[PDB]
């Protein structure tokens, strides 16, 4: 299985590292996938590019 994660830009390499590790373990537990068959990848979305209720994350002071 594959997991595509979308995050607002600015998380650290460490947090990214924990996303990949924890979501890999989650996918292993939930569906029994061999660890080495699990791909997780992350899109960093700029704050001008992410909207919640019609207002950008940049406007919302995220």
Q: With breaks defined as C to next N over 2.5 Å, after which residues does the chain break?
A: none
Which of the 8 DSSP states describes residue 8? E
Task: Kindly name the residue from 1, 10, 46, 51 that is annotated as catalytic.
Answer: 1
Please state, in angstroms and rounded to a whole number, the distance separating the CA atoms of residues 2 and 4.
7
Is residue 60 involved in binding a second copy (CB under 8 A)?
A: no
Is residue 39 involved in binding a second copy (CB under 8 A)?
A: yes
Annotated active-site residue 1? The verdict is yes
Residues that bind a second copy (CB under 8 A): 1-8, 11, 13, 15-27, 29-32, 35-46, 48-56, 58-59
Q: Would you please indicate which residues are annotated as catalytic (active-site) residues?
A: 1
């Amino acid at each position: 299985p594959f997991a595509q994660i979308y995050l607002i830009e600015g998380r650290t390499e460490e947090q990214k590292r924990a996303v990949i590790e924890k979501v890999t373990q989650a996918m292993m537990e939930a569906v029994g996938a061999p660890k080495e068959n699990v791909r997780v990848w992350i899109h960093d979305v700029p704050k001008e590019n992410w909207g919640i209720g019609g207002v950008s994350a940049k406007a919302l002071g995220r």
